[PDB]
Design a protein around this ligand. Structure first.
Ligand SMILES: [Zn+2]
Ligand SMILES: [Zn+2]
Ligand SMILES: [Zn+2]
Ligand SMILES: [Zn+2]
Lengths: 206, 206, 206, 206
C-alpha cells in the first residue's frame, strides 16, 4: 500500500463500476482512507483518461493538494470516514435502481437475505439537501451509523467497506436489491419480507 | 478544427452512442455547426461503414453538397442552431426511455437534481408533426428556446450543447432521467419532485 | 450470390442477432429464398460452432438434403415465402418483448411512426397452435398477407424482408416497439396512438 | 472425462453464466456428479481468478478434500443429486428475475411452451429456510422430484440436467420465463396460460 498502488486501484474501481452499469456519464467517485485523510478522484478529468498522478489527497482538515480539484462529493466521503472508523473505502454513484428507490424516499426492507450484508434489516434513505453542503454531510453521517450503505434521496447511493473490492461489491449488491424491490413493488405492496428473527440468524451467521 | 477532424469526431459520436444503447438500428444522426451552416451524417450509409468523406455539409440556406444525401432529420438540426445561438452540436435519437415518455406526451419534471443540466426544472415534449416538414421544425424551435434538450412526441429525443462530448453526455443523462421517471411512475403518481426553489439553487450553483 | 456466400451471411445474421439480444439460448433460426425453395439453419448444432457446410437446403416440396436436419421451424418459413412473394429472407426469434406482448395476445398499435415499417398501422399476433404443424403454418400465412412481421401468441416473432440485413433490422425495430408498448402500457391503457390518417402519410412518404 | 477436464468445464460455466447476466458479484456456484459424490466450486476465491486446482471434490458422505472450502451451497447440490438420479450437473444462482418471482413466492405457470423444458407445466418455488441447513436441503429435494429447476423463495434459482451445457442453458431459459412472467404480470393478473392438454402435447413431442 503505497500511494500509487492505491491510486491505480481507485481507477480500476472506476472502470470496473462502469463495466457493471453502476456508473453512467461519470456520475460517481471513489475514495480510500490514507494517512490522516483520504485519496479521492478529482473533478472534471473524464474516467477513461485518468492516471495515478491525478488522484488527489485531501488531508483530515479539508486541505487538498494544490494544483488539483477534488471531486465535488468529497465532503460526504470524509463524513463517511469519521462516522465509521472501520470504513477504508467509499464508493459513490447514481446507479439507476438505487436512485429511483431514493426518489420514492424509501428504505429497501428485508426482501432477501443479502440485506444483512449492509449490517442490518434494511438499506436506509438520507433526506435530500443541496449537494456539497454541511447538512448533506450530516444526513449521510446519521445514516451510516449502523449501516454500511445508504440511499441519498433524489440523488444516488453511497457504500462503504474495509477495501475497494468489498465496497465495489456492496454497491453492486445494493443495486440488485433495489431492482428486486422496484420490480416486485410494481406487482404488489407491501412486498413480502423476511422477519427480524430470520434476519437475526443471518447476521449472526455472517 | 478542420472539416476532417470534425467528421471523425461526428462518427466517433455515432459509435459511442451505439455503445451506450442510445442508438438502435441506425435511428439517430449527429451534427456540428460549421462555417455558415453545419456538418451532418448522411442518410443510408450504415453507421459501422462510415468515413469522413461521407459527412455532408448543408450550408445556411439548405443547399447541400451535390453527390451526398444529408440525413432526413437535417431540418430540425438547422432549427436547433437558429433557435440557440450557443449550440454547436446536435444529437438526435430514439433512445427507448425518452421515446416511451414522449409517447405518453409528458415532460419529465424535477425528480432529480440533474434535471437542471438542461437549463431548467423540466425536459419538455414537442407535439407530433410529420417528420421532415416545416411545422416539426417550428415545434422543436419553441421547445429549445429555454431548454437544451427536448422530447419529440411519438418520436424521440434531440439534445444540444457546446460540443459533441457534452451533447452526447446530455443525451445520455436525459435517458437516465426518462427511465427513472417511468420506473418510479409505475409505482406512484405523481412522482415526488424537488421544488422550484431547490432547483433554483442547483441552477445557480452550476 | 453463391450458396456459400448466403450460408456465411445466414450465420452472420445469427451472431448479429445474438449480439443485439434478439436471440437467447439458440431459440431463433434464419432463412433465405434459394433456387426453388430456401436455405435454413439446421437443428441442434449450437450457433457459435456453425459453418457454411451445415446450412441445409429444403427444396420447394419439403424435401431436405439427406444428412442434415433442418431447423424445426422450417414449416412456417416456407409459409412465409409462399405467402409473400416479395420476401427473400425470414428471421425467427423469441425476443423477450415481442413474446411478452404475444403472451398478452395483442397487436402493437401505432404508438410510434416506425410502425409503418412493417407495412401498415399495427403488428399483429397469430393465434397459438402446436409448433411445427399444418395449422400454425396457416396462421402465420394469414398474418403476413398484409404485414411484414407478426407476433406468434405464447411463442415469439417472425419478420420478413428483401434481404437479411433488412429482415434482421425489422426484427430489431419490432422489438423496440414491443418494449415501448409494454412500458408505456404499465402506466396507462389505452396507450396513445397516431391516427390512421397520420400513418397514411407515413406509409406514402416511405 | 478426467477430473481436470470437468474442472475446466465447471469454470467455463462460471464465466459463461457471468457473461449472460445470470451471475452477479459471485453469487452462484456450479457442480458436476463425480465418482461417489461431486465436484464443486469453492468458497471465497473470486470467479475470475479460478483454476482446476481449486475445484473441490466433496465425497458422498459430505467429506471434503482437506485444504479447500467447498461453496456454502454444497448441501443442496447433494440434495439435488440424491433427489434426481438422472442429474449430472447442478447450477445455482440469484439471477434477478427468478429471485423477484421467488420473492413473491410464486410458481411460473405455462405462459409459454418452453415451460415444458423443466419437465411439466410450471416452475415451482421452495419455501424459505436458513441457508445451509437440513430443512433447506429437504425443500429443494421435494421440489426437484418432478421438476428439473426450482425457485428458492427470498433467495434464487437451482437448475439441473444431464450436463453443464444443458444445465446452464436451462438456468437461462428459466430466467427468460421469469421475466416474461413479471413483465406481463405488471399489466394483467392472471396472465394467460397454455392449457394442461396443450402442454401435454408439448411434453410428448419433446
Ligand atoms: Zn452524486
Ligand atoms: Zn428520428
Ligand atoms: Zn420458435
Ligand atoms: Zn445462493
Amino acid at each position: 500500500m503505497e500511494r500509487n498502488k492505491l491510486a491505480r486501484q481507485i481507477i480500476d474501481t472506476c472502470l470496473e463500476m462502469t463495466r457493471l452499469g453502476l456508473n453512467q456519464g461519470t456520475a460517481g467517485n471513489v475514495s480510500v482512507r490514507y494517512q490522516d485523510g483520504m485519496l479521492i478522484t478529482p473533478t472534471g478529468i473524464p474516467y477513461e483518461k485518468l492516471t495515478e498522478s491525478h488522484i488527489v489527497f485531501i488531508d483530515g482538515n479539508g486541505k487538498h493538494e494544490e494544483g488539483k480539484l477534488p471531486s465535488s462529493s468529497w465532503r460526504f466521503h470524509m463524513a463517511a470516514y469519521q462516522s465509521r472508523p472501520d470504513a477504508n473505502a467509499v464508493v459513490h454513484n447514481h446507479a439507476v435502481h438505487c436512485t429511483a428507490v431514493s426518489i420514492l424516499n424509501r428504505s429497501i426492507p428485508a426482501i432477501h437475505y443479502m440485506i444483512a450484508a449492509a449490517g442490518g434489516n434494511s438499506i436506509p434513505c438520507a433526506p435530500y439537501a443541496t449537494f456539497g453542503t454541511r447538512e448533506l454531510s450530516e444526513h449521510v453521517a446519521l445514516a451510516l451509523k449502523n449501516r454500511k450503505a445508504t440511499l441519498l434521496q433524489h440523488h444516488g447511493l453511497i457504500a462503504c467497506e474495509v477495501n475497494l473490492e468489498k465496497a465495489l461489491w456492496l454497491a453492486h449488491e445494493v443495486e440488485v436489491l433495489a431492482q428486486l424491490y422496484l420490480t416486485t413493488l410494481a406487482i404488489t405492496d407491501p412486498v413480502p419480507v423476511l422477519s427480524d428473527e430470520e434476519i437475526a440468524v443471518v447476521l449472526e451467521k455472517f
